[PDB]
Amino acid sequence: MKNKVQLITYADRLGDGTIKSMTDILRTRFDGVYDGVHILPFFTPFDGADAGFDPIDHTKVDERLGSWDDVAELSKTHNIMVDAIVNHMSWESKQFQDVLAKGEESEYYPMFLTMSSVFPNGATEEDLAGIYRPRPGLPFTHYKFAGKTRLVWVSFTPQQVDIDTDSDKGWEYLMSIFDQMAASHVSYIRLDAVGYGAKEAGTSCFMTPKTFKLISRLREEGVKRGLEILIQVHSYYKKQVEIASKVDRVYDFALPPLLLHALSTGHVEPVAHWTDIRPNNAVTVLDTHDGIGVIDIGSDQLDRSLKGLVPDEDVDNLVNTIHANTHGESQAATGAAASNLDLYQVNSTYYSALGCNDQHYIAARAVQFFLPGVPQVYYVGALAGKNDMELLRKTNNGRDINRHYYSTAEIDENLKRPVVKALNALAKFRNELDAFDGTFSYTTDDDTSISFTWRGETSQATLTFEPKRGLGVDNTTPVAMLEWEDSAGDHRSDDLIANPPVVA
Amino acid sequence: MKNKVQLITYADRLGDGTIKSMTDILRTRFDGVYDGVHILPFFTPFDGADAGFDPIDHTKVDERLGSWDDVAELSKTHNIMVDAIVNHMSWESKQFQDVLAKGEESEYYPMFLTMSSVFPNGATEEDLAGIYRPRPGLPFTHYKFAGKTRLVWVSFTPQQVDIDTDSDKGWEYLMSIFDQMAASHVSYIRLDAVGYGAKEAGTSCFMTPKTFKLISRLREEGVKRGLEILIQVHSYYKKQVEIASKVDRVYDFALPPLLLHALSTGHVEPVAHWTDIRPNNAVTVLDTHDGIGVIDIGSDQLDRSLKGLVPDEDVDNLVNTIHANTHGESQAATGAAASNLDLYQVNSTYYSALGCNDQHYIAARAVQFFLPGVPQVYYVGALAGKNDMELLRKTNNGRDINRHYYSTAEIDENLKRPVVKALNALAKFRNELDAFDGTFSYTTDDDTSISFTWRGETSQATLTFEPKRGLGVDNTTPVAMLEWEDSAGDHRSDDLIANPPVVA
Ligand SMILES: OC[C@H]1O[C@@](CO)(O[C@H]2O[C@H](CO)[C@@H](O)[C@H](O)[C@H]2O)[C@@H](O)[C@@H]1O
Ligand SMILES: OC[C@H]1O[C@@](CO)(O[C@H]2O[C@H](CO)[C@@H](O)[C@H](O)[C@H]2O)[C@@H](O)[C@@H]1O
């Protein structure tokens, strides 16, 4: 995977509404800033039950957004990452509809999971209670198979029916997705919710050996087609560390909340410790299209004796801090407060999570870019966006607070903001200084500060992060300084916003 | 149960917000109109997860509303109906809280239902799939009993834990409710969601023989205490007809939708047929504190070959007509559109469902009052209220569209409306003419009109209902005329709004 900053975006929420438009925005407003792009599900349809993650036809681009040719055109200037929704599909798919009509007579009957498919001999309370869940309630919903009420397995919305990834039909379906991406100039594949992909009676059905098998098999298929695979997994940090050595890339989901913690408390020890044990074959982010994950650094939910990267007490303080910095906005969109598939992810833009503090935000992005791994910036964060309360009120979908619709006009207006200009420059810097393609090293000043250093062929850079320099949402004091040497001398920025770094 | 019109209301949504104020409004604004009242759950707390139906302490009046002293005061002028929430209780009750902390070591452990309590030897998909549900999804949620994850049985919100009505602790509790009501001057008891109260592996757990046993037993406990029981049951019409012969009262839930059908299509035949087979030991209503039930007249949800009171297509047109008449308001509050416990009840005030046609509304109330049974008028309907989109947007609880908060000021304002004056006068008429305590009979003019007649000791009255006379939400033509004889001779009204009936 190219070691350049990537943009995560919905094709229709950045620009006029199409892939062509999004492409234009990237090439004319972010040239040299984002050399890669993760286009969120743009298949048929993109506006269903779960914003693209409930595809009726995964291999067909929603004609309202564009075509596969638009993707090919885009590939000429940007490396493309696309999702491979391996765990489920829309109940409105031809396959599932055939099952509703014909039931066991349908050739697609084996393709979908039901309670009996996993528990042919029935189940005890323990069997079902032991299934891992991102929120309270069992993963089943009612559907009629040829007039017979069946309990279909659904990990997320009731409209997203889980497929048997180990069935012939399920596997054929997944491979057709891989073939389509490989023939459409896609460079990377994101395996959505792969941790849920395998079910086995008596297990948690989440990140078990049977899951590792599925992941391993999908990677093989990926290598066969020259595609790199990034797997998405929100879980106890230990599972992320362990699975990392078996795949090309994993997300670094611990950094986002660890940085909010550091920026709000001044404590960097947790960041230093994570730096020392984290998987370095990762894709870094601060914000994503979902809410901010916190169980990603907390104790194991299935066994509280297994502690996280910080005490559970610090996680609760972290969460309450976001609620305070957003004046209740995040509280109104998080968990049971609105429609959500996950109970603990905190719904709020990262910028709002920090109380819209520019120095803290630019600093967080700086640390993100300095830790090993390919960095990604969510489009709302790319424009330092605030919580979209109007959209939340309209849809009641918790995560929409962080899924604002950016018109071309809004983009140009926001591009004038000092903090957005600073991020554009920081991203450009991270793409042009060859030090980031060299050796990494760091030193820590006893829970007070941490310095990240990269040494490359013709340059080197050192970022010093010291949160205690500017605590408070109203803080205007920089909490990050940068020193670097390039082909044109020895430089230094004591304020990434007033003095954005630029490569000679 | 006295054969006088009753009002259904929240103690806090009619007046200043207290039981005392609610009492004052009844006595000073509705004297002779509403002689009895069903006060919706006013226990601790009244503003929890399900507006009073998730009690932490069923035997304690919420201190913010008043005390049992206020209920005694009211009883001096009005016969009071109260709810006996026999199916579940708040997860915050001391009893459940004790179980979470101590698990099996809690003396209340046997009091609550879990999957294993009903399925001790496990369950097949068929077992779980056959459990009747008012909305998709299994009736179970996660709770930790002394650290152990358990699947607790919950028919409604996850905060409402179902009790074992067959356990000693469960029955002891229910009897504490009955004892409190009998010792607090309550006259009637409404058995809430009693159709769900009995669970048995292999059965639907809804209105089954085991349910009949529970009802029969609860009725005995009422009889022993001098309390009359009304059971709330929303089901395939035949089930209401059958259970009626075993209890004092049942609601007439078929009439509300049958009248909307009649007023919209002009077909009265369905009403004539219902009049012929309906349980006459009923409590009549148009609107309730819940949504408008339509499965109450449609085909059986389990077996569709068991037809309803009108063809299915007609039930569909009825639902669509309400959505059209409210110009999408009811659609935004119904089913999956907002938080709801029942997928098919249509959320709209009865007035709004009728396109606010005053003549249609007053005629509907007239038919309600003329069919055998004790009439109840929901408070929103008592003031001919429209859908409250403000409240709906604020809470996102679908049924809130029909749960407006009426201050004393707004009440008096509404009392000046001609249709509201007409309803008060009609209710007073229904309470003063002794014809309603005599013999009932009706004649029908083949699907076009139907006349209801009552003959008493010193009076007689005949209501002729003919929707065809003035169809449309925009019509001003009366669709009901009244003729009666009292101590002053013969009288007549061809317009219940312009010329309300007054007993000599
Ligand atoms: O809040 C979303 C919820 O789902 C997870 C599972 O990994 O995220 C991915 O899968 C969902 C179902 O396809 C999508 O809605 C979501 O957009 C996607 O990233 C976690 O983020 C969380 O548990
Ligand atoms: O829409 C509510 C849903 O519940 C029923 C069950 O009879 O109504 C009663 O019980 C609920 C849970 O206590 C209450 O929320 C509701 O207010 C009460 O009348 C049906 O009307 C429907 O299926």
Side-chain angles (χ1 to χ4, degrees):
Chain A
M1 188 178 282
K2 302 301 183 176
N3 186 33
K4 305 295 183 186
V5 187
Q6 297 173 14
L7 173 78
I8 305 166
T9 189
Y10 284 110
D12 68 308
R13 307 197 193 201
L14 180 76
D16 301 327
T18 61
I19 303 182
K20 273 187 176 63
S21 184
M22 167 201 90
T23 297
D24 183 66
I25 295 300
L26 278 171
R27 293 172 170 168
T28 61
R29 275 73 172 184
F30 298 101
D31 185 59
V33 180
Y34 298 114
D35 299 322
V37 61
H38 168 195
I39 310 168
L40 292 167
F42 51 95
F43 326 109
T44 305
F46 68 91
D47 64 335
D50 185 31
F53 285 93
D54 61 307
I56 288 177
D57 188 340
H58 198 311
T59 67
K60 182 171 68 180
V61 175
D62 193 297
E63 57 83 27
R64 291 173 293 171
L65 296 181
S67 66
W68 280 116
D69 187 67
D70 294 318
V71 173
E73 167 58 44
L74 172 62
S75 75
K76 292 172 179 179
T77 59
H78 295 68
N79 296 299
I80 306 168
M81 174 185 289
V82 170
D83 288 90
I85 310 173
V86 299
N87 185 73
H88 47 265
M89 66 197 288
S90 175
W91 71 287
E92 293 191 59
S93 57
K94 289 186 176 182
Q95 303 92 316
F96 192 66
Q97 289 292 307
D98 192 66
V99 176
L100 294 181
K102 306 172 182 171
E104 302 179 4
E105 294 310 304
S106 172
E107 66 178 301
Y108 296 107
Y109 180 64
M111 201 182 137
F112 302 96
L113 294 177
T114 67
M115 181 181 276
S116 66
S117 72
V118 183
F119 297 99
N121 295 145
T124 62
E125 187 189 321
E126 292 58 53
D127 296 317
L128 305 176
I131 303 171
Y132 174 72
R133 295 290 297 148
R135 59 173 176 175
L138 297 181
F140 297 107
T141 198
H142 305 75
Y143 274 111
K144 295 187 189 308
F145 284 15
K148 179 178 179 180
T149 304
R150 296 303 300 285
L151 281 176
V152 175
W153 199 305
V154 296
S155 302
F156 303 101
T157 67
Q159 295 67 46
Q160 285 159 300
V161 295
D162 291 35
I163 62 175
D164 182 335
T165 64
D166 204 38
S167 65
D168 294 315
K169 283 292 181 176
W171 193 247
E172 169 184 63
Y173 170 67
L174 297 182
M175 291 303 97
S176 71
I177 293 176
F178 273 45
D179 294 325
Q180 183 63 47
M181 302 318 170
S184 307
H185 303 75
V186 178
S187 296
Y188 326 116
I189 294 297
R190 168 183 187 280
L191 302 188
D192 179 63
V194 73
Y196 293 89
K199 280 74 172 186
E200 182 68 55
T203 69
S204 68
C205 297
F206 184 71
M207 292 304 286
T208 64
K210 192 172 179 180
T211 309
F212 300 166
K213 189 177 184 183
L214 171 62
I215 295 177
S216 176
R217 196 184 186 183
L218 292 175
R219 183 178 177 175
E220 301 184 324
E221 295 302 323
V223 166
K224 187 182 291 63
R225 303 175 172 65
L227 290 170
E228 303 200 318
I229 77 86
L230 161 65
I231 63 168
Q232 188 230 15
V233 182
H234 284 281
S235 67
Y236 180 50
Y237 82 91
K238 294 267 193 174
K239 299 185 190 302
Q240 272 264 262
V241 179
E242 170 165 47
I243 191 64
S245 63
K246 305 176 186 179
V247 296
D248 292 301
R249 305 272 178 169
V250 293
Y251 277 98
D252 180 331
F253 287 137
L255 190 61
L258 285 178
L259 280 177
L260 291 178
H261 172 66
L263 288 162
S264 63
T265 69
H267 304 157
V268 299
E269 191 291 307
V271 174
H273 175 57
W274 177 237
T275 293
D276 187 58
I277 68 174
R278 70 192 288 279
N280 295 308
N281 60 314
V283 169
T284 58
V285 294
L286 285 184
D287 52 345
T288 62
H289 61 300
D290 297 323
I292 299 171
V294 298
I295 59 86
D296 303 77
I297 64 171
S299 60
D300 194 315
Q301 307 174 78
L302 290 59
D303 184 346
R304 297 299 171 177
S305 58
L306 305 179
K307 296 293 176 291
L309 297 172
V310 298
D312 288 309
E313 292 61 53
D314 285 301
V315 177
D316 299 324
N317 295 333
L318 177 282
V319 171
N320 288 319
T321 287
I322 297 169
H323 294 325
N325 292 345
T326 64
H327 303 107
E329 299 180 318
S330 58
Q331 171 69 58
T334 301
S339 303
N340 292 303
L341 296 175
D342 187 303
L343 179 65
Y344 297 114
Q345 292 182 324
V346 184
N347 295 322
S348 168
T349 64
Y350 206 77
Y351 187 60
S352 286
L354 289 167
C356 304
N357 192 295
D358 294 6
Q359 289 299 328
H360 291 175
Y361 184 57
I362 194 60
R365 286 290 179 201
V367 173
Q368 185 206 334
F369 295 0
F370 270 74
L371 282 175
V374 175
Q376 293 191 320
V377 178
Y378 180 57
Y379 81 103
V380 170
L383 301 161
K386 286 168 54 66
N387 285 323
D388 194 323
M389 301 312 289
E390 170 48 47
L391 188 60
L392 170 62
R393 191 210 69 183
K394 179 175 179 175
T395 68
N396 195 216
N397 186 47
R399 289 173 289 173
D400 288 353
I401 190 177
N402 179 50
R403 294 179 184 177
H404 182 72
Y405 283 84
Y406 282 100
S407 64
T408 299
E410 288 182 61
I411 297 176
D412 291 320
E413 190 57 35
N414 285 92
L415 281 168
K416 298 178 184 182
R417 293 165 63 200
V419 68
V420 174
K421 292 184 175 301
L423 178 54
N424 268 14
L426 187 61
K428 178 175 170 63
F429 179 77
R430 173 63 173 68
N431 293 326
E432 310 182 319
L433 199 73
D434 71 17
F436 295 111
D437 293 318
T439 55
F440 172 72
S441 71
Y442 80 93
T443 62
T444 182
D445 184 300
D446 53 296
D447 188 53
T448 289
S449 71
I450 184 167
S451 300
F452 304 104
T453 296
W454 288 86
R455 294 188 170 81
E457 298 185 58
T458 68
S459 63
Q460 82 171 85
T462 296
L463 177 77
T464 300
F465 181 52
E466 197 187 317
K468 71 176 299 299
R469 288 193 168 200
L471 297 175
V473 302
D474 296 316
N475 166 72
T476 60
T477 301
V479 296
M481 67 175 78
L482 166 69
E483 306 166 73
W484 82 96
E485 299 164 49
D486 51 32
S487 70
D490 304 351
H491 317 284
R492 175 174 167 172
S493 173
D494 294 315
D495 189 318
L496 299 180
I497 290 175
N499 186 11
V502 185
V503 173
Chain B
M1 186 180 280
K2 304 300 177 176
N3 191 30
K4 304 299 183 192
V5 186
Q6 287 175 23
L7 177 72
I8 302 166
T9 187
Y10 285 104
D12 67 311
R13 313 213 187 197
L14 189 73
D16 297 323
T18 64
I19 293 173
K20 169 183 172 175
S21 178
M22 173 203 87
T23 297
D24 175 60
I25 292 299
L26 276 172
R27 288 170 177 171
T28 61
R29 308 299 197 298
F30 295 103
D31 190 47
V33 185
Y34 298 115
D35 303 334
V37 59
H38 165 198
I39 312 171
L40 290 166
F42 47 98
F43 324 111
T44 303
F46 72 84
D47 57 344
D50 190 27
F53 286 96
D54 62 304
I56 285 180
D57 190 343
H58 204 311
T59 69
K60 188 179 64 183
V61 179
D62 189 293
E63 69 186 74
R64 294 168 289 170
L65 299 191
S67 63
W68 285 113
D69 281 39
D70 300 317
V71 175
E73 171 54 50
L74 170 61
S75 68
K76 293 178 182 180
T77 58
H78 295 65
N79 291 300
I80 304 163
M81 176 180 292
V82 180
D83 286 279
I85 307 167
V86 311
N87 185 65
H88 47 263
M89 60 196 292
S90 172
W91 74 286
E92 299 184 71
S93 63
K94 290 185 175 184
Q95 298 94 315
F96 194 71
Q97 285 296 304
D98 194 63
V99 171
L100 294 181
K102 299 169 179 169
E104 301 187 8
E105 297 303 300
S106 170
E107 63 183 297
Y108 297 110
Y109 180 75
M111 170 174 222
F112 302 103
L113 292 172
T114 66
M115 183 179 277
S116 64
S117 70
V118 177
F119 298 95
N121 296 151
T124 62
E125 187 188 314
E126 298 56 60
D127 288 325
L128 300 182
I131 299 170
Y132 174 77
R133 294 293 294 150
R135 55 168 179 167
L138 294 180
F140 296 107
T141 194
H142 300 76
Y143 277 112
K144 283 185 181 303
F145 282 14
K148 177 173 170 61
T149 302
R150 297 301 304 287
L151 285 180
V152 182
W153 197 300
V154 295
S155 296
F156 302 97
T157 70
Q159 289 73 42
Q160 285 164 298
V161 295
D162 290 33
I163 57 180
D164 184 341
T165 62
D166 245 311
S167 69
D168 298 313
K169 286 294 182 180
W171 195 254
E172 167 183 296
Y173 168 64
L174 297 183
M175 294 306 93
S176 80
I177 296 176
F178 278 45
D179 289 337
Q180 179 65 51
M181 302 316 168
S184 304
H185 307 77
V186 167
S187 291
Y188 321 124
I189 292 301
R190 171 178 183 283
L191 297 187
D192 179 69
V194 69
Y196 291 88
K199 281 75 171 186
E200 186 64 46
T203 74
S204 68
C205 295
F206 185 70
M207 290 304 276
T208 70
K210 191 173 184 180
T211 316
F212 303 158
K213 185 178 183 181
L214 170 65
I215 294 176
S216 176
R217 192 187 182 186
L218 287 171
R219 183 183 176 185
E220 301 184 306
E221 290 304 328
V223 171
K224 189 185 290 64
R225 298 180 179 66
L227 300 168
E228 294 195 306
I229 67 161
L230 159 63
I231 63 172
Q232 180 219 31
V233 179
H234 279 288
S235 67
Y236 175 54
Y237 86 89
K238 290 187 176 299
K239 293 188 187 298
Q240 274 266 252
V241 174
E242 180 174 54
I243 195 68
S245 60
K246 312 168 192 175
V247 298
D248 304 306
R249 304 269 177 175
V250 294
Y251 278 98
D252 183 339
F253 287 134
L255 191 63
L258 288 177
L259 290 182
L260 293 177
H261 169 66
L263 291 163
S264 294
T265 67
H267 300 305
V268 300
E269 186 288 322
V271 176
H273 172 57
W274 177 235
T275 301
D276 182 57
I277 65 171
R278 72 188 291 278
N280 296 122
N281 59 314
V283 165
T284 61
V285 303
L286 284 190
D287 53 348
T288 70
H289 59 295
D290 293 322
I292 298 172
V294 297
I295 60 90
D296 304 72
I297 64 170
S299 293
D300 189 72
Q301 300 180 79
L302 175 61
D303 187 336
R304 291 301 175 183
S305 66
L306 306 184
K307 313 315 298 178
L309 297 169
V310 298
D312 296 309
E313 183 171 61
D314 293 284
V315 176
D316 290 330
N317 296 336
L318 163 67
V319 170
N320 293 325
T321 290
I322 302 173
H323 294 326
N325 286 352
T326 69
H327 295 78
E329 301 176 322
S330 61
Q331 184 77 75
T334 300
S339 295
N340 287 305
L341 298 175
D342 189 302
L343 181 70
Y344 300 114
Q345 292 187 324
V346 178
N347 293 323
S348 177
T349 65
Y350 204 78
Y351 189 62
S352 283
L354 283 169
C356 304
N357 182 309
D358 291 340
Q359 290 298 338
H360 290 181
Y361 186 57
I362 197 58
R365 285 294 178 196
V367 175
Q368 190 210 325
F369 294 179
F370 264 71
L371 280 169
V374 182
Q376 294 191 318
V377 179
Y378 181 56
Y379 84 104
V380 173
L383 303 172
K386 290 198 58 168
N387 288 322
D388 191 336
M389 305 309 283
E390 314 312 313
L391 184 60
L392 170 60
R393 187 183 65 168
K394 184 178 181 180
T395 69
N396 194 53
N397 187 48
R399 291 172 289 172
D400 280 353
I401 192 177
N402 179 53
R403 295 178 178 180
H404 182 77
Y405 284 94
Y406 284 98
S407 65
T408 297
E410 181 163 33
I411 290 174
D412 295 314
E413 203 60 45
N414 278 287
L415 282 172
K416 302 192 295 189
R417 294 169 60 199
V419 59
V420 178
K421 288 185 187 295
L423 185 53
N424 287 338
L426 182 58
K428 191 180 177 68
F429 176 75
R430 175 66 174 63
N431 294 326
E432 307 177 320
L433 194 65
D434 76 23
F436 296 103
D437 294 315
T439 52
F440 172 78
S441 65
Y442 82 87
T443 53
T444 185
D445 184 303
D446 61 305
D447 195 58
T448 65
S449 76
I450 181 172
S451 301
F452 303 98
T453 297
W454 286 89
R455 298 195 178 76
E457 294 184 62
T458 65
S459 63
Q460 164 177 167
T462 297
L463 179 78
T464 300
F465 184 50
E466 200 179 319
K468 208 159 180 179
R469 284 187 192 177
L471 298 169
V473 301
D474 210 45
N475 214 309
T476 56
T477 304
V479 297
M481 55 177 253
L482 175 65
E483 318 175 79
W484 81 96
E485 320 185 7
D486 52 30
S487 62
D490 295 308
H491 305 289
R492 177 170 176 163
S493 173
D494 298 298
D495 190 318
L496 301 177
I497 294 172
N499 185 37
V502 182
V503 177

